[PDB]
Nucleic acid binder design. Structure first.
Ligand SMILES: [Mg+2]
Ligand SMILES: [Mg+2]
Ligand SMILES: [Mg+2]
Ligand SMILES: [Mg+2]
Ligand SMILES: [Zn+2]
Ligand SMILES: [Zn+2]
Length: 603
DNA sequence: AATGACTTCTCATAAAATTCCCGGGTA
DNA sequence: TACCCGGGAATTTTATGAGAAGTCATTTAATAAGGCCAC
RNA sequence: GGGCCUUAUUAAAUGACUUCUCGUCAAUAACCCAUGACGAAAGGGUUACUGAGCAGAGCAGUGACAUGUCAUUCGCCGCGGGGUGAUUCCAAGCUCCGCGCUCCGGCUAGACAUGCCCAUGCUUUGGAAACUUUAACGGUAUGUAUACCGGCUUACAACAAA
C-alpha cells in the first residue's frame, strides 16, 4: 500500500512508495503520522519542487457495495477502496418511525375518546364517514375524526413558473387535445373527435372512427395510437398531476429555453446519493484528485425477472396488472372474489404472505385475499399459516436495493459534473466488462472502479497492485429513547411456559390462555389452577438508550492497536469492535481517537 | 438497424444474571 | 500460617411488537407515438 | 441515426395524512387458586370499572368534543410569518397563525347558536463539521519485543544499485 503525503497546508501531495524514507523522516521530525489507516503522513517542511501528476478518481456505484480507485495519468493504481454502506437499514428505520408516530397519535385519540365517554360527548350512531376523494368509508367510531389531508400535498410544481399544476382527472380535455392536435384532420373533425370521446358514447365513437378511417386512413382503433391513448383518457380517475400549468401545457418546446426540475428523493435514495458524493470528498483528503469517472447503471426490472428471454420478446407495456384496475382488484379477479383458505366468505384484508416486517414484497406474487377471521388465524396459528403457503408461496423483496441505485444515477452524474467542471467522465457497464476481459482482471468493485478510471485515460500498463482498503458506513444519529421492550414472560419451576396473557398478533407461541387450555386437557382443572397459581412473571419492560453516548464508527486505541467501535454493552461500560467477535473492550482501558466520521476505515 | 452490463442478502444494547475479587472472622 | 463466605465490583449472557382499512405522493427504468433539433 | 421534453401503458421501489384491532403498562373492586416469615406479611390468574400512550419528558400555544341550521363560505393551495425536528451546522417530515383567491383541491373545512370539558403541534429519519497524543509496511540479528537496514524527488522521468 502507498503512503499518502500531506503538505504543511494540509493539502494532498502525490503518494510515496519509499517506505524506508518514510521511517527515516518519522524518526527525525520531517513528518508526523496523521493516520494509521489509510496510513497517512504530513510533512513538517516545504519541498524544493511541488509538481503533481493528474489523478483520476473512479467509482463503481452500488447500494451496498461502492468501489473506488485512484489512477495516475499514466495508468498506475495509487489506491483501491471497497465501501460497504448502511443503506439497507433506512426503509426499516422509517417503517419503525411510521409505527411509533401513528401509535402516539392513536394514544392522543384514545385519551380524547376516554374523556368523551366520561362526559357523554361521543358521536350518536356514527359508523364511519366518506371523504371527498374516497368511495368507501373510513371505519371511524366514537368521535368524528381528525382532519385527513391527502387530496393535494403539492410536490410537483410548474417547471416554467412555480405555479401549481392540475390533476389529470380534472383537465382530461387538455390531455386529450394534446394527442388530437397533431392529426391530419380538419379542425371541426378534431373538435368532433375530442367531444365524442369526452361524452363516452361507445357506439357514436365507433361511427366517427369508421367514417374518419374511410376518409383519412387514420388508425382510430381502441388498441392502436392515437385511439388507445384517447380511450384511456376517458377513465373516471387518472394518476397524479401535470408538469406544466394550463397556460404552458398548451406549448411543447419550453425544455429548449426555460426549466426548474423541482426534484425529490426518499430518505433511502437521498442517503445513498450523499454516500456516493461523500466518498469522492473523503478520498480527495488523501490524494491530489483532478478528475472524476463514474459508471451509468440502468435497470429494467422485468428483464432482470426474465433473463433468458431476449429484450424485444418482453412485454414491458403489459405485465401482471395491465387494465386490471390495480393490485387489490387483480387479486380479487384471480381468486373469484372469495377468501383463499376457505372459499365461502368474501375478501376483507389483502394479506402479505411473507409479512411486511419479514422482508416481504408488495407485488401481486406476495398477496392473498382473506376474510378478517382467517387473517387473524394465519397470524396466531402455525397450522393455518402452513396451509396458506401450500396454495401460494409468496416472495421477499427481489429488487429493493437496485431500485434505489437506479433512482440516484441521473442526479449523481449532474452533481459530479457541477463539482468537477470539464474534469468529469462517464462509462457504461459493458465498457467495464470489455476492459476487464482485455486485461485479464477479475470482477470486484475496486477492480471495476480501476477500469472506470481508465476509460478517460490511456494507461501505459494496466496492472492492479495494492491490497484494497475496506470502508464501513455508520449512522450519524439515533434519536430513539426506547432501545427494546420485553414480552410478559410467564415461568413455572423457572422454565418459560407462556409470553403474554392472551396472544399478540404475530404470536405463534403460547399465551396463558393457550397454555392453561392444554394443561386442563392433560391434568384437569384443579391441577391446571394449582399450576397458574404457582407462576412467576416478568412484566413487559422498556430498556432505554443512553443519550450522548459514543456512536458506532468511533475509532479508538486499546493496548497500542487501532479498533473501530461496532456497539456498546452495559450502559457504555464495554465496547464491541469490528472483526473481534463478542470481545468486550473495557471503556476505561480505551483512548478515543475520533468520533464517528460516517465513512470509517477498517482492517 | 439492436443491445450490450450492472446489483443483490441478520443487530446494538441495557440491564439482569453470573462470576470474580478483596476483606474478614475464624481456627 | 491459612481457609471458606460474603458483599461489591466486574464481566458475561439474554432478549429484542405486530396486523389491517380510506386515500394520496415521488423517483428511476422499459415499451409505444410526437416533437424539437440533427450529415 | 442521437439528446431532451411530453403523453399512454407497465415494471421496481419508498414517502405523507387519517382510521381500526390484538398485545402491553398503572390502579381499584369482586371472584378462583397457591400459601404461612416469627395467627398473619410475600404470590398467579379471571371478569368488570378507570387511567396510560418514546408507560413519558422537553420547547412552543388555546383549544378539544357533542347537537342544531347555513352550506362550496373553506383549505392540504398562493403570499407572509412562526413551532418542532434542533442544534456543533443543516436537511427531510409534520404542523400553527395572518391575508388571499392568479393557481390547485373541496359540503375538506368554515361561520353562527347552545351544552361540556382541558381534550393543541412536533419529537424512534439523513448527511456534514469538530476531536488528534493515530510511527504503518518489508527484510535481517536474538528470546514475541527491544535493536538495525529497504539509493535520489511529495511525485514523474533520468540516473544509481544488480
Ligand atoms: Mg458497476
Ligand atoms: Mg391525561
Ligand atoms: Mg396480513
Ligand atoms: Mg459492482
Ligand atoms: Zn406556467
Ligand atoms: Zn376463511
Amino acid at each position: 500500500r502507498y503512503v499518502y503525503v500531506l503538505d504543511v497546508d494540509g493539502k494532498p501531495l502525490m503518494p510515496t512508495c519509499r517506505f524506508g524514507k518514510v521511517r527515516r523522516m518519522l524518526k527525525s521530525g520531517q513528518a508526523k503520522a496523521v493516520d494509521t489507516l489509510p496510513f497517512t503522513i504530513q510533512l513538517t517542511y516545504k519541498p524544493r519542487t511541488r509538481i503533481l501528476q493528474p489523478v483520476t478518481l473512479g467509482q463503481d456505484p452500488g447500494r451496498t457495495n461502492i468501489g473506488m480507485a485512484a489512477v495516475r495519468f499514466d495508468g498506475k493504481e495509487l489506491g483501491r477502496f471497497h465501501c460497504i454502506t448502511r443503506n439497507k437499514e433506512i426503509p426499516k428505520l422509517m417503517a419503525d418511525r411510521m409505527a411509533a408516530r401513528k401509535a402516539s397519535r392513536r394514544g392522543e385519540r384514545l385519551a380524547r375518546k376516554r374523556l368523551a365517554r366520561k362526559l357523554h360527548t361521543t358521536a350518536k350512531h356514527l359508523n364511519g364517514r366518506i371523504l371527498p376523494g374516497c368511495s368507501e368509508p373510513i371505519a371511524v367510531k366514537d368521535i368524528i375524526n381528525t382532519e385527513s389531508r391527502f387530496n393535494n400535498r403539492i410536490l410537483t410544481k410548474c417547471k416554467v413558473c412555480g405555479k401549481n399544476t392540475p390533476l389529470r382527472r380534472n383537465v382530461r380535455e387538455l390531455l386529450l387535445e394534446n394527442i388530437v392536435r397533431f392529426l391530419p384532420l380538419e379542425s371541426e373533425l378534431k373538435e368532433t373527435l375530442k367531444r365524442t370521446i369526452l361524452e363516452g358514447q361507445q357506439g357514436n365513437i365507433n361511427k366517427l372512427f369508421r367514417k374518419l378511417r374511410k376518409v383519412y386512413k387514420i388508425t382510430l382503433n381502441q388498441k392502436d395510437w392515437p385511439g388507445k391513448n384517447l380511450t384511456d383518457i376517458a377513465k373516471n380517475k387518472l394518476p397524479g398531476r401535470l408538469p406544466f400549468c394550463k397556460e404552458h401545457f398548451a406549448e411543447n418546446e419550453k425544455f429548449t429555453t426555460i426549466e426548474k426540475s423541482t426534484f425529490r428523493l426518499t430518505p433511502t435514495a437521498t442517503q445513498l446519493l450523499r454516500t456516493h458524493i461523500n466518498l469522492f470528498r473523503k478520498l480527495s483528503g488523501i490524494l491530489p484528485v483532478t478528475d472524476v469517472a463514474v459508471e451509468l447503471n440502468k435497470f429494467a426490472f422485468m428483464q432482470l425477472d426474465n433473463p433468458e428471454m431476449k429484450k424485444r420478446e418482453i412485454d414491458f407495456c403489459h405485465g401482471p396488472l395491465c387494465g386490471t384496475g390495480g393490485l387489490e382488484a387483480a387479486v380479487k379477479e384471480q381468486q373469484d372474489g372469495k377468501c383463499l383458505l376457505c372459499g365461502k366468505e368474501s375478501i376483507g384484508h389483502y394479506h402479505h404472505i411473507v409479512p411486511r416486517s419479514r422482508r416481504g414484497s408488495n407485488t401481486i406474487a406476495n398477496i392473498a385475499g382473506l376474510c378478517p377471521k382467517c387473517h387473524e388465524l394465519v397470524h396466531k396459528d402455525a397450522d393455518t399459516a402452513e396451509s396458506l403457503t401450500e396454495m401460494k408461496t409468496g416472495l421477499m423483496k427481489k429488487y429493493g436495493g437496485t431500485s434505489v441505485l437506479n433512482q440516484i444515477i441521473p442526479k449523481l452524474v449532474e452533481t459530479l459534473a457541477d463539482l468537477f467542471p470539464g474534469h468529469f467522465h462517464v462509462t457504461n457497464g459493458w465498457n467495464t466488462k470489455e476492459f476487464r476481459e482485455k486485461h485479464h482482471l477479475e470482477k470486484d468493485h475496486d477492480v471495476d472502479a480501476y477500469c472506470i478510471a481508465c476509460s478517460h485515460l490511456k494507461p501505459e500498463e494496466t496492472l492492479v497492485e495494492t491490497e484494497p482498503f475496506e470502508i464501513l458506513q455508520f449512522r450519524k444519529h439515533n434519536r430513539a429513547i426506547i432501545h427494546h421492550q420485553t414480552e410478559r414472560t410467564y415461568k413455572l419451576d423457572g422454565v418459560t411456559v407462556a409470553k403474554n396473557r392472551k396472544k399478540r398478533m404475530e404470536q405463534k407461541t403460547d399465551s396463558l390462555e393457550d397454555w392453561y387450555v392444554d394443561m386442563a386437557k392433560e391434568h384437569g382443572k384443579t391441577q391446571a389452577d394449582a399450576m397458574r397459581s404457582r407462576l412467576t412473571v416478568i412484566k413487559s419492560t422498556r430498556y432505554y438508550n443512553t443519550p450522548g453516548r459514543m456512536m458506532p464508527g468511533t475509532v479508538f486505541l486499546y493496548e497500542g492497536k487501532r479498533y473501530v467501535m461496532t456497539g456498546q454493552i452495559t450502559n457504555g461500560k464495554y465496547y464491541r469492535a469490528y472483526g473481534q467477535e463478542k470481545r468486550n473492550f473495557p471503556a476505561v482501558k480505551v483512548r478515543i481517537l475520533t468520533k464517528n466520521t460516517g465513512l470509517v476505515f477498517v482492517a
